[PDB]
Amino acid sequence: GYDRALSIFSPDGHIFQVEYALEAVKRGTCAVGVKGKNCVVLGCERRSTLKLQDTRITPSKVSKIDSHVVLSFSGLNADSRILIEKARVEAQSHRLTLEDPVTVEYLTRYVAGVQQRYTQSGGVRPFGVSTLIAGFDPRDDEPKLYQTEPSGIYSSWSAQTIGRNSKTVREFLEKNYDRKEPPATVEECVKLTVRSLLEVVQTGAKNIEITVVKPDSDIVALSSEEINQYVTQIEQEKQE
Amino acid sequence: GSRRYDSRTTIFSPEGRLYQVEYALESISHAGTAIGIMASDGIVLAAERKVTSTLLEQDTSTEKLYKLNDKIAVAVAGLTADAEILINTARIHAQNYLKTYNEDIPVEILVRRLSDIKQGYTQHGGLRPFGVSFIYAGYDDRYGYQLYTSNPSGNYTGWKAISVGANTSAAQTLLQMDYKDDMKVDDAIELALKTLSKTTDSSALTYDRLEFATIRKGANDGEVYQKIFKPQEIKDILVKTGIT
Amino acid sequence: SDPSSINGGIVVAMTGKDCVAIACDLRLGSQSLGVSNKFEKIFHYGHVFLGITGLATDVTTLNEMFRYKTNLYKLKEERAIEPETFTQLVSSSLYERRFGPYFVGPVVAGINSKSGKPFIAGFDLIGCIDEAKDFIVSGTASDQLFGMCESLYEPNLEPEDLFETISQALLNAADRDALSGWGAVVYIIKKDEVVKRYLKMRQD
Amino acid sequence: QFNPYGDNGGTILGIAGEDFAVLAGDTRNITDYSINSRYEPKVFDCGDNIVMSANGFAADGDALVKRFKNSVKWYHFDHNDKKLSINSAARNIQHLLYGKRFFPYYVHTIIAGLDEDGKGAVYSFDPVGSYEREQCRAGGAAASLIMPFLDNQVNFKNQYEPGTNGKVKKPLKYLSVEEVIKLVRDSFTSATERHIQVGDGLEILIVTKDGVRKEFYELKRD
Amino acid sequence: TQQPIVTGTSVISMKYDNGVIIAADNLGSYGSLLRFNGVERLIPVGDNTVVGISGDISDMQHIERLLKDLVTENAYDNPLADAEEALEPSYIFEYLATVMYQRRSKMNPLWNAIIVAGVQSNGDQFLRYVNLLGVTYSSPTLATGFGAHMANPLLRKVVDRESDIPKTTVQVAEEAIVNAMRVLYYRDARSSRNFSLAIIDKNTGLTFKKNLQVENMKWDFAKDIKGYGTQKI
Amino acid sequence: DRGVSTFSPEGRLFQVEYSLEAIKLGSTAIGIATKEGVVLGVEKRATSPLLESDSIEKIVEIDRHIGCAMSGLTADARSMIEHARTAAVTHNLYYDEDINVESLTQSVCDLALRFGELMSRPFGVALLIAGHDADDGYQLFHAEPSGTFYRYNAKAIGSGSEGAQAELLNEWHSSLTLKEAELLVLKILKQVMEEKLDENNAQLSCITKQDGFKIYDNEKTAELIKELKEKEAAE
Amino acid sequence: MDIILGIRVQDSVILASSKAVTRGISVLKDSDDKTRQLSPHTLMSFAGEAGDTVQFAEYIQANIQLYSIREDYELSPQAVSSFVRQELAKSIRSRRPYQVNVLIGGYDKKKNKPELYQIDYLGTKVELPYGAHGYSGFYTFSLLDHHYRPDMTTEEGLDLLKLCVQELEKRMPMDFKGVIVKIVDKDGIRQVDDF
Amino acid sequence: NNYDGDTVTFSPTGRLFQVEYALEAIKQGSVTVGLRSNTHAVLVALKRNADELSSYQKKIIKCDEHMGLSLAGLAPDARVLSNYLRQQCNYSSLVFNRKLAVERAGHLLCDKAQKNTQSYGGRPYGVGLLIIGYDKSGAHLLEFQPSGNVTELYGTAIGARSQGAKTYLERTLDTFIKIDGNPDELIKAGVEAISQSLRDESLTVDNLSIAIVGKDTPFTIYDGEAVAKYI
Amino acid sequence: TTTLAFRFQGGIIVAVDSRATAGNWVASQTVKKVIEINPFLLGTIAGGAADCQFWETWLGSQCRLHELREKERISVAAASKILSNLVYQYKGAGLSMGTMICGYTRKEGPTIYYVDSDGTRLKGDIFCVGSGQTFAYGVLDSNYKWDLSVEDALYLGKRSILAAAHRDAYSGGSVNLYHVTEDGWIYHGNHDVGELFWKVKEEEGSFNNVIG
Ligand SMILES: [Mg+2]
Ligand SMILES: [Mg+2]
Ligand SMILES: [Mg+2]
């Protein structure tokens, strides 16, 4: 078989293939994750360069791994499907053997482990994908939000963004998100998520996707009109 | 040893792009234009054969439009030989699904499968990717009529109207201009041929330089019919629409 | 114990003048226990008809397999498979399981679309082709069917006469077999029309 | 049909004292009604103050002892010449035996030595690796002749104190190494009289903090 | 798993004061048929070891080739192949014993009973047994098959324990072996009159005697024996 | 290009030397061994204030008697930790005992050079393995991607390693108490850390014979930081 | 395990399964639920050799749940039954076959119809109005043949099911410790806690 | 230059640069001395420390009761080769009830190192070994190079500044060979030999490492206060 | 062999006999038929001794690896299923096992899983396994209540083994008692059946048929 070591160290101690995988993530559409007091919201950018699209059947940016966990991403779309599939299989495998669904941290740790494996295996390149994994642990009302990246490192976040212009929306979140008092309701959390995307998105029409996840496997994706109402209210308050 | 001669087909550029995928897309841009248009009562597939000859046996020829099963068809853009390898794999997957569940394979599942195969060649194996872009036209009882496209990266997306191959920039603008949601098959047939007629690199668009197909519910009662147009039938629709 | 006589059932096929006929009972059982009176044993792939007796799981499995294979055949050949070609396919497919076979008694029937010639064929579980002119029999009442067919059959029967012959051959054979009956179906096949008739019979 | 197993007879006996341990075994080796050898050592010093015997089918017995001795050697290499404690050896032997769960070593294994607190220790194994620390254990051909005698004379079973009449048990007083060796010798003398596969010679290995010592005694050769 | 076809019967042996003696007849039986009368079943290895083999002859020939190959292999990159690093009886035995047990553990045994007789570097007598099961044992006297039942009792009357070995001379030991071979000829239905005898002495070395015969046999008393009970004539 | 297992003209493996450069870029981890226990401490180094710092796990339990701190490409350590845990548990299964700290470290270091064209590159992470056994007592090891491991009385790895090691050179003596070691790690971490040291961006842990391996609470560490400030202001 | 029944009525499917678990000499449990929910509107009961039954049922459950997540869509009962049959048909020619018989009761939300599928360990699938496995049919089918109507209500189906269970309790030598009854309809799966 | 990218490439002058670079790693390694008489064989090794807090890297490894070696270079490679020797010594004991000849042990090490020099993908071993042992032909001392070359010697030294010790042994040849039935005096000659390779630093208690094997002496390593006698 | 385990208000009682036999021959009277998997989990031994010892000791290793990885106590459900899935892989090979995996966690409470070498895995409130199981079941069924005290429950388990030890020829020697709480199991001593029988006979008035 093909055994070539593609991911290797350079004189300055860098693994360029892992670093170039991050550049693929930088090119990807923006994704944002914000956790409130009793919810987590996953915002995603849809570049409006592609019109005449069929939004019914086009792969959605946010994906359910189980009934209680979701996964969004920035970077290579084709690569994301491989991680999503592996995660979904592992979720069912965990339920089958442990007789309990995965914790959000466990599912994150697994996906991050797969990404890591591809950074020191022969004949393979790293995933050009960073993920935001969100949900609620079984029989638990504490919100969870995690991030992963091509190198395989993962960590928990009060709020986080990835993808193109993620520097700008992270800047926004760092000043607007208060740890001592996070978004108390679903409305406040979704509003802050939409606001953060409006710093980058361009138009607030079909370019913003919002998915709200609540405790006890309560996941719902907002429609165009529902999101448009947030976009309207934000800009009307801004005119002052 | 052998390492010396390895092109390393599955690596990132400093900018974070896959060299071979990008170069395969450049290859596909020189291939004959293929267009898919989705209407409320059917789908149209139109495609241009590349600089043909007068001695080419057209009626038995097939380089653009292929049948995956009774419900799903594809338009090809790129290396024909590469496409046929993938097409046979897709035909088998559809049959495996039918054998397992005793139901026709949903369009997206088939598209995802083929797109995942393409993806594999970009991440591992050290082989060159398939220099092929597909337009998938199909129907199932969940989402109804569907148009998809996949490219050598393994990325696929859904569309109302889409082009692949040569002059996609020009073609996609023309489709975006004249397409509407309440459109019908006979109107979509006219749009597809009009778009090719303007984007073509040939002096004039004729029947011998075209392949054409429609997926209609225009079949006797609740069922779907695939129609791969014959050379004489393509000649008729060109006169009907007023191009020749 | 014997896999070919657990579920029971029969298939018979006959040739006529510019026509073929294939027929089967509807019983599926677990030895003495009757389980289903709707288990049809005749399938078709285009204009080629296939009856399969024997172990019911294999009947189902092989039907799904030949549907699979004839569908790919059609996509590549750009035409529906013919009875002569399909017969060879059935034979090849059974023999590739030579030392672990499907416990079945298949029966091919159909008319060649180009030549218009009536065709029937039978196989043992392992793929050996029996290409008879007159008739093919299969199932747990094959002896009874051989006896019925040998006496009742005469060559060059018209479709509506052939129907009566094959129907009476099946019905009376099934009434002398404990594991066959519970209804019956008869296909009368012509070059461009096929009539399917359900027969009324004793339900014991 | 080829039968890969055989019975080489023999009988072994392990007894755990207070600060010592003994592992005894007869030196006779047999097949059917013939004597192969009148002196074929069966109890072995395996190093690290551990003694071992694998009674039953002699080929499997020799194979197991050989593999365990090898395990002691590699335990030293891999773990900085650390002493293998009797409990660790016992667990290691379980894995050797259970490793051939579906084609077992046809032997009844016994090891003896001192635990990490210096007290006497004997471990007993079945052919497939189930084991247990025990105070007293006879193994092999004449095991059924020896164990009831040991229950009575070591553990004082069914013995009560005169005058009380079944109300007060005889107290479990500690036996010295000289007292144990007497019971071992009388066990094998009795076993020799009533069991045809037992005889020729008795070899006893005594384990103390000072090391491993050997004692040999003649048995009847008929 | 197989069955033995062409077979060799008893191998007998004993220790004496300066070395070991080993003997075995020259017969390769084919069931009850006494097929092959010129089969050598004592195979010397170097000038200090003799391996006596009973049981399946085809497996014996295989073992014979392994030992021949062992000598070749030992000589490779070994300047002391004919001196300090020469093959010992103990090395040869342990090798065979490993093979026998490995083969029985794969359920495909070498269908044999083997006795390795020799003298070590330090002059110590070596005599040890191994068979198709991989079972091994040592004793002042060792014998396979019928020899175990008839030879051992006679040889044990000469060397009954370890302390009798220094008291036993080569002439006494050889006499006992030769007598045992006669007894086996009387009573083993799968034996022959012709046999080979090998002596490995620490002083005089390896003495290999071929084409020996059982002699001084008692048969004359047979003339007087008549009928099976009542018959007088 | 060039082989992965290639020697340089100086006689070193290029890839191993380059992995050491990656470890220099990693966050600081410090270990100090005493007769009352071994202390392990790390710099968390959160890349943003929105990152929940308690999810940064750079100190890890291998067994009840063995702990581990890491520095460098921390994602690479996960398989090393998995192997270590398996080795510790497997040895207990085979031998009904705790495994020696050195033997555990040797098992981890055997993976290191299993790379070529096995994994495609060396590990980009160094480990401070701390623990206790009955034979050699309290021990601290430094496991490198070269496959070499050194035992230490005290050791610092990461970006502030050479500066911290010089500080450990002067400060360490054989009669250190556990409390003295805890403050000493916090002192040296605070020196080499870019951001100001507090209970949220730095973590402590220890391994004792009685209580085994324990990661310190943020509340417990906060008190030790406050105790440090006062004793430094005391002179 | 012993007795598993199924009956498809007008607007639902009813599965009855025995509660007993016997280990040769003793009855170890008398409250065992011999069923798994494959999807919100599809229930599978099972009976056969010990270990194999639950191992198989849970393996199927995991696979259908995996499909549900991937496609965000519930497979039809027909599709599920075909998938299950293939696994059993694959199993029968394996080194060690699954010794498991199943009934799959489901409500097709597309067609708005209840569906009952009977599949044995060989991979023998049949769609039925009412079904059973093992010896259960020998006692109950004569009653079902007599009383059954395709337009029965759920309450009538339960009454006919009680009559079947009563006949089993009278003429079967084994004590199966009663049955757990579950109903599968448009609203999903629910258990009849009093029976 | 252009012919040092891998071990499979000869230079125009017929050299294997990767092997020579592996040889260079030994010269960077700490000094170790080997010497023998007719009765005993001795290994003396100068252990190296990372710094004052660190331990001193162990140099000597035991292979069997009658054999062992000292290393200089990549320690992990020595662990691989020593492990392989342990197995071969152990194979000989188990199968043939025979202690492995020291000369034959060298032949095995040569052949193992050789395979790594002729095949693509792998690399040469980056360590030199000094094997001592006592077998049926008396005491022995071998020098292993990762090129594959194994050499039987009366005495030798490998590592940094090893030439000084090697010259000393070349002068003392006639003296130390005659040290029969006296382990302490043979070790003294080894400690005096390794002292010729020292600059700046001197032999301390945790610095020095000594091993010995002989007629009635199993292979035993001496470290710590056990070697204070010889300082 | 006779082994039992039952759930109650105060957690779980586990009780076993101590006899080991090879045919009619009594190999041992001092066998341990409770495997201490870890400080919180217990497992009983019936059928093959080696199979139970080996794989339940192995189970303890898996439980340890779980809580190292997951930083959380393994559930009784998860622990039992690791064992049942393992033996199910070996199904047909000839493993002989009949065990109760017993534990007490926060999320589950006191839980008992019967695990079998046939692959059977059953949750339950009362289980008895072994050649003397039927005798133990009788005493349990007639006297069991959820609201038993820890003292009475321990006695009920002890008395039920005694019932089997008396009647079943392949059970006896001594009784081992365990009490499983949320904070871990607590050992309640070894009780010689010989001495226990006369003690119970006199104090309880039972076994009137037997002359004492
Ligand atoms: Mg009937
Ligand atoms: Mg006698
Ligand atoms: Mg498992």
CATH value at residue F35? 3.60.20.10
Nearest residue on chain A to F78, alpha-carbon basis? A113
Quote the CA–CA distance of H178 and H165 in Å, as a whole number.
19
Amino acid making up residue D4: P
Task: Give the CATH number for residue I40.
Answer: 3.60.20.10
Classify C30 as helix, strand or coil: strand
Write down the CATH number for the domain with range B1-244.
3.60.20.10
Quote the CA–CA distance of D125 and I36 in Å, as a whole number.
19
Classify C164 as helix, strand or coil: helix
Quote the CA–CA distance of B38 and B147 in Å, as a whole number.
6
Q: Are strands G179-185 and H138-144 parallel, antiparallel or unpaired?
A: unpaired
Domain span at residue C122 reads 1-204
The CATH class of H1-231 is alpha beta
Q: Are G182 and G190 in contact (CB under 8 A)?
A: yes
Gap from CA of B174 to ligand 1 centroid (Å): 72
Gap from CA of D222 to ligand 2 centroid (Å): 4
Other C-beta atoms closer than 10 Å to the C-beta of C13 total 31
Nearest to I178 by CA among I49, I59, I12, I39: I12
CA atoms within 13 A on the CB side of B210: 29
Quote the CA–CA distance of D149 and E84 in Å, as a whole number.
54
How many CB pairs (< 8 A) connect A and G? 22
Q: Are B83 and B66 in contact (CB under 8 A)?
A: yes
Quote the CA–CA distance of C70 and I66 in Å, as a whole number.
51
Maximal C-alpha separation, chain C:
47
Residue C128: Cβ-neighbour burial (10 angstroms; 0-12, 13-18, 19+): exposed
Ligand nearest to the CA of C31: 1
Q: What angle do CA G179, G184, G189 make, to 5 degrees?
A: 85
Torsion of CA H197, H201, H205, H207, to 10 degrees: -60
User: F89 vs I64: CB contact, 8 Å cut-off?
Assistant: yes
Quote the CA–CA distance of I68 and D209 in Å, as a whole number.
39
**In chain G, which residues have their Cβ closer than 8 Å to the Cβ of I119?**
50-52, 54-55
Q: Are F182 and F206 in contact (CB under 8 A)?
A: yes
Structure tokens at D162: 């005169």
B138 alpha-carbon distance from chain centroid: 11
Nearest to E85 by CA among H92, A113, I47, I29: H92
Which sign, positive or negative, has the C-alpha torsion B214, B220, B224, B230?
Answer: negative
**The CATH homologous superfamily of the domain defined by G1-195:** Aminohydrolase, N-terminal nucleophile (Ntn) domain (3.60.20.10)
Q: Do chains H and D touch (3 or more CB pairs under 8 A)?
A: yes
Which sign, positive or negative, has the C-alpha torsion E164, E165, E166, E171?
Answer: positive
F117 touches chain B (CB under 8 A): yes
Gap from CA of A216 to ligand 2 centroid (Å): 81
How far is CA F110 from each of CA C17, E96, F113, F122, rounded to the nearest angstrom? 82, 36, 7, 12
Dihedrals phi, psi of H69, to nearest 5 degrees: -140, 165
Domain span at residue I151 reads 1-212
Residue environment code for H165-187, b if the CB has 16+ CB neighbours within 10 A, otherwise e: bbebbeebeeebbebeeebebbb
Q: Are B24 and B167 in contact (CB under 8 A)?
A: no
How far is CA E209 from each of CA A230, E54, E178, H70, rounded to the nearest angstrom? 111, 18, 12, 52
Q: Are D54 and E162 in contact (CB under 8 A)?
A: no
Quote the CA–CA distance of G9 and G16 in Å, as a whole number.
14
According to DSSP, the residues that pair with H49 across neighbouring strands are H56
Nearest residue on chain G to I85, alpha-carbon basis? G55
Mutate: best of B8, B19, B123, B145, partner A, most A CBs <10 A: B123
CA atoms within 13 A on the CB side of G50: 20
I94 touches chain D (CB under 8 A): yes
Domains and their CATH numbers in chain A = 1-240 (3.60.20.10)
Helix count and strand count (H, E) for chain B: 6, 10
According to DSSP, the residues that pair with G105 across neighbouring strands are G43, G116
Other C-beta atoms closer than 10 Å to the C-beta of B228 total 16
Quote the CA–CA distance of F113 and F128 in Å, as a whole number.
18
CA R_g for chain D: 18
Number of domains in chain C: 1
Quote the CA–CA distance of F122 and F21 in Å, as a whole number.
12
Residue H218: Cβ-neighbour burial (10 angstroms; 0-12, 13-18, 19+): middle
The residue assigned the tokens 């010992």 is: E88
Q: Torsion-angle region of residue A139: left (phi > 0), alpha (psi -120 to 50) or beta?
A: left
CA R_g for chain C: 16
User: F7 vs H18: CB contact, 8 Å cut-off?
Assistant: yes
H99 touches chain D (CB under 8 A): no
Q: Strand order in B65-67's β-sheet?
A: B65-67, B72-78, B132-140, B144-150, B156-159
Gap from CA of D196 to ligand 2 centroid (Å): 7
Structure tokens at D170: 């005889």
Gap from CA of A139 to ligand 3 centroid (Å): 25
- The experimental resolution of this structure, in angstroms, equals 2.7
How far is CA A8 from each of CA B13, F3, F50, F117, rounded to the nearest angstrom? 15, 11, 31, 12
Within chain C, strands assigned E span: 10-16, 19-25, 28-30, 33-36, 42-45, 48-54, 104-111, 118-123, 129-130, 135-139, 184-190, 193-199
How far is CA F109 from each of CA F90, H75, H172, rounded to the nearest angstrom? 17, 11, 41
**In chain C, which residues have their Cβ closer than 8 Å to the Cβ of B228?**
none
Amino acid making up residue E184: L
Chain C nearest CA to B180, separation (Å) = 34
The domain limits of chain G are 1-195
F137 touches chain B (CB under 8 A): no
User: E136 vs D62: CB contact, 8 Å cut-off?
Assistant: yes
H86 touches chain D (CB under 8 A): yes
CA R_g for chain H: 18
DSSP string, F194-224: SSPP-TTTEEEEEEETTTEEEEPPHHHHHHH
Q: Are D141 and D195 in contact (CB under 8 A)?
A: yes
I65 touches chain F (CB under 8 A): yes
**In chain D, which residues have their Cβ closer than 8 Å to the Cβ of F103?**
78-80
Quote the CA–CA distance of B84 and B35 in Å, as a whole number.
19
**In chain D, which residues have their Cβ closer than 8 Å to the Cβ of E101?**
59, 63
Dihedrals phi, psi of A175, to nearest 5 degrees: -95, -30
Classify F171 as helix, strand or coil: helix
Residues of chain D that touch chain I, judged by Cβ-Cβ distance less than 8 Å: 94, 97-98, 101-102, 126, 128-132, 134, 144
Chain F nearest CA to H179, separation (Å) = 37
Quote the CA–CA distance of F109 and F145 in Å, as a whole number.
7
How many CB pairs (< 8 A) connect D and H? 6
User: A156 vs F54: CB contact, 8 Å cut-off?
Assistant: yes
DSSP string, chain A: ------S-B-TTS-BHHHHHHHHHHHHSPPEEEEE-SS-EEEEEE--TT--SB-TTTSPPSSEESSSSEEEEEEE-HHHHHHHHHHHHHHHHHHHHHHSSPPPHHHHHHHHHHHHHHTTSSTTB---SEEEEEEEE-TT--SEEEEEE-TTS-EEEBSEEEESTTHHHHHHHHHHH--SSS---SHHHHHHHHHHHHHTTSS-SSSSEEEEEEETTTEEEE--HHHHHHHHHHHHHHH--
E40 contacts: CB under 8 Å, gap ≥ 6: E26, E196, E210
Residues of chain B that touch chain F, judged by Cβ-Cβ distance less than 8 Å: 3
Quote the CA–CA distance of H21 and H126 in Å, as a whole number.
8
The residue assigned the tokens 């000393």 is: H168
Quote the CA–CA distance of B180 and B161 in Å, as a whole number.
10
Q: Are F209 and F130 in contact (CB under 8 A)?
A: no
Quote the CA–CA distance of G50 and I117 in Å, as a whole number.
10
Q: Strand order in D136-140's β-sheet?
A: D136-140, D11-16, D21-26, D201-208, D211-218
**In chain C, which residues have their Cβ closer than 8 Å to the Cβ of B93?**
none
H199 touches chain E (CB under 8 A): no
Which sign, positive or negative, has the C-alpha torsion A232, A233, A234, A239?
Answer: positive
Where helices occur in B29-145 by DSSP H, the ranges are: 80-101, 107-123
Where helices occur in B102-184 by DSSP H, the ranges are: 107-123, 168-178
Nearest residue on chain B to A82, alpha-carbon basis? B116
Q: Are G117 and G104 in contact (CB under 8 A)?
A: yes
Nearest to D32 by CA among D6, D62, D56: D6
**In chain G, which residues have their Cβ closer than 8 Å to the Cβ of C67?**
none
The domain limits of chain B are 1-244
How far is CA B5 from each of CA B1, B2, B129, E29, F151, rounded to the nearest angstrom? 9, 6, 18, 67, 45
Which among D2, D4, D34 is the nearest to E148, CB-wise?
D34
Quote the CA–CA distance of H193 and B127 in Å, as a whole number.
59
Gap from CA of I84 to ligand 3 centroid (Å): 7
Gap from CA of C203 to ligand 1 centroid (Å): 7
Quote the CA–CA distance of B226 and A111 in Å, as a whole number.
42
Ligand nearest to the CA of C34: 1
**In chain I, which residues have their Cβ closer than 8 Å to the Cβ of G96?**
91-92
Nearest to G129 by CA among G96, G151, G111: G151
Structure tokens at C58: 């294999």
Nearest residue on chain I to D158, alpha-carbon basis? I194
E30 contacts: CB under 8 Å, gap ≥ 6: E5, E6, E7, E36
Q: Are strands C184-190 and C193-199 parallel, antiparallel or unpaired?
A: antiparallel
Quote the CA–CA distance of C70 and C77 in Å, as a whole number.
10
Structure tokens at H163: 């030439």
Structure tokens at E5: 């076809």
Q: Which experiment gave this structure?
A: X-ray
Nearest to B160 by CA among B141, B187, B179: B179
The residue assigned the tokens 């330089």 is: B209
Which stretch of DSSP H or E encloses residue C99?
A: none
According to DSSP, the residues that pair with G182 across neighbouring strands are G15, G191
Q: Strand order in F125-133's β-sheet?
A: F59-63, F66-72, F125-133, F137-143, F149-151
Amino acid making up residue G187: D
Number of domains in chain I: 1
I149 alpha-carbon distance from chain centroid: 19
Amino acid making up residue D171: P
Nearest to F127 by CA among F193, F78, F90, F169: F78
User: G62 vs A95: CB contact, 8 Å cut-off?
Assistant: yes
Classify C119 as helix, strand or coil: strand
Other C-beta atoms closer than 10 Å to the C-beta of I130 total 26
According to DSSP, the residues that pair with G181 across neighbouring strands are G16, G192
User: E136 vs D59: CB contact, 8 Å cut-off?
Assistant: yes
I169 is in an annotated binding site: no
DSSP state for residue B29 in the 8-state scheme: T
CA atoms within 13 A on the CB side of I151: 0
3-state SS record for chain D: CCCCCCCCCCEEEEEECCCCEEEEEECCEEECCEEEECCCCCEEECCCCCEEEEEECHHHHHHHHHHHHHHHHHHHHHCCCCCCCHHHHHHHHHHHHHCCCCCCCCEEEEEEEECCCCCEEEEEECCCCCEEEECEEEEECCHHHHHHHHHHHCCCCCCECCCCCCCCECCCCCCCHHHHHHHHHHHHHHHHHHCCCCCCEEEEEEEECCEEEEEEEECCCC
CA R_g for chain B: 18
Amino acid making up residue B36: G
3-state SS record for chain H: CCCCCCCCCCCCCCCCHHHHHHHHHHHHCCCEEEEECCCEEEEEEECCECCCCECECCCEEEEECCEEEEEEECHHHHHHHHHHHHHHHHHHHHHHCCCCCHHHHHHHHHHHHHHHHHCCCCCCCCEEEEEEEEECCEEEEEEECCCCCEEECCEEEECCCHHHHHHHHHHHHHHHCCCCCCHHHHHHHHHHHHHHHCCCCCCCCCCEEEEEEECCEEEEEEEHHHHHHHC
Quote the CA–CA distance of H84 and H103 in Å, as a whole number.
15
According to DSSP, the residues that pair with H210 across neighbouring strands are H44, H222
User: D40 vs E138: CB contact, 8 Å cut-off?
Assistant: yes
Gap from CA of E178 to ligand 2 centroid (Å): 25
Q: Are A122 and H121 in contact (CB under 8 A)?
A: no
Quote the CA–CA distance of A130 and A149 in Å, as a whole number.
4
E39 contacts: CB under 8 Å, gap ≥ 6: E8, E26, E27, E28, E57
How many CB pairs (< 8 A) connect F and H? 78
G33 contacts: CB under 8 Å, gap ≥ 6: G17, G19, G180
C148 contacts: CB under 8 Å, gap ≥ 6: C168, C169, C170, C172, C173
H41 contacts: CB under 8 Å, gap ≥ 6: H34, H35, H132, H133, H134, H139, H140, H141, H212, H213, H214
Quote the CA–CA distance of C162 and C16 in Å, as a whole number.
6
Nearest residue on chain H to B2, alpha-carbon basis? H120
DSSP state for residue E221 in the 8-state scheme: G
Which sign, positive or negative, has the C-alpha torsion D95, D100, D105, D106?
Answer: positive
Q: Do chains D and I touch (3 or more CB pairs under 8 A)?
A: yes
User: F95 vs D92: CB contact, 8 Å cut-off?
Assistant: yes
CA R_g for chain E: 19
User: H4 vs F9: CB contact, 8 Å cut-off?
Assistant: yes
Residue I125: Cβ-neighbour burial (10 angstroms; 0-12, 13-18, 19+): middle
Nearest residue on chain B to A23, alpha-carbon basis? B16
F143 contacts: CB under 8 Å, gap ≥ 6: F105, F108, F109, F112, F126, F127, F128, F129, F149
Domains and their CATH numbers in chain E = 1-233 (3.60.20.10)
Q: Are strands G179-185 and E42-45 parallel, antiparallel or unpaired?
A: unpaired
Quote the CA–CA distance of B86 and B78 in Å, as a whole number.
12
Quote the CA–CA distance of I9 and C161 in Å, as a whole number.
82
C15 alpha-carbon distance from chain centroid: 13
Q: What angle do CA H150, H209, D47 make, to 5 degrees?
A: 85
Q: Are C182 and C41 in contact (CB under 8 A)?
A: no
How far is CA A14 from each of CA A147, B73, F18, F142, rounded to the nearest angstrom? 22, 47, 8, 22
